[PDB]
Design a binder for this molecule. Structure first.
Ligand SMILES: [Ca+2]
Ligand SMILES: [Cl-]
Ligand SMILES: [Cl-]
Ligand SMILES: [Cl-]
Ligand SMILES: [Cl-]
Ligand SMILES: [Cl-]
Ligand SMILES: [Cl-]
Ligand code: NA
Length: 121
């Protein structure tokens, strides 16, 4: 699927290595993010919330994209598809930017370990 494919292209990792990382990557989220990669996911959730408030269904939207030397190019028939691509693009770029502190120990992080307050969007 789309976001997964973008994650793989931009990070060199498998999609599943971001699908359940930390306290925010993967469905829902609560408490304080564990690291910068997790912050990308906190922000991505916020981005999807903004799209939902605009009338989009970002968990369901399918979009088009290409990756060249110039970056990620988003596309789609509808504005909601293009918005979803923009949210994903920002998160995939955030993942790449933070590859230096990605830690395998936060993949499949048990949710009971998430503590502290929940940052606002
Ligand atoms: Ca999440
Ligand atoms: Cl951090
Ligand atoms: Cl965002
Ligand atoms: Cl491509
Ligand atoms: Cl880009
Ligand atoms: Cl590691
Ligand atoms: Cl790794
Ligand atoms: Na429109």
């Amino acid at each position: 699927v789309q976001f997964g494919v973008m994650i793989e292209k931009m990070t060199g990792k498998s999609a599943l290595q971001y699908g359940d990382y930390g306290c925010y990557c993967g469905i829902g989220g609560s408490h304080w993010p564990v690291d910068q990669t997790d912050w990308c996911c906190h922000a991505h959730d916020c981005c999807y919330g903004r799209l939902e408030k605009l009338g989009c269904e970002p968990k369901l939207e399918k979009y088009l994209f290409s990756v060249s030397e110039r970056g990620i190019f988003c596309a789609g028939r509808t504005t909601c598809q293009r918005l979803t691509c923009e949210c994903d693009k920002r998160a995939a770029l955030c993942f790449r930017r933070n590859l230096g502190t990605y830690n395998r120990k936060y993949a499949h992080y048990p949710n009971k370990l998430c503590t502290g307050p929940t940052p606002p969007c």
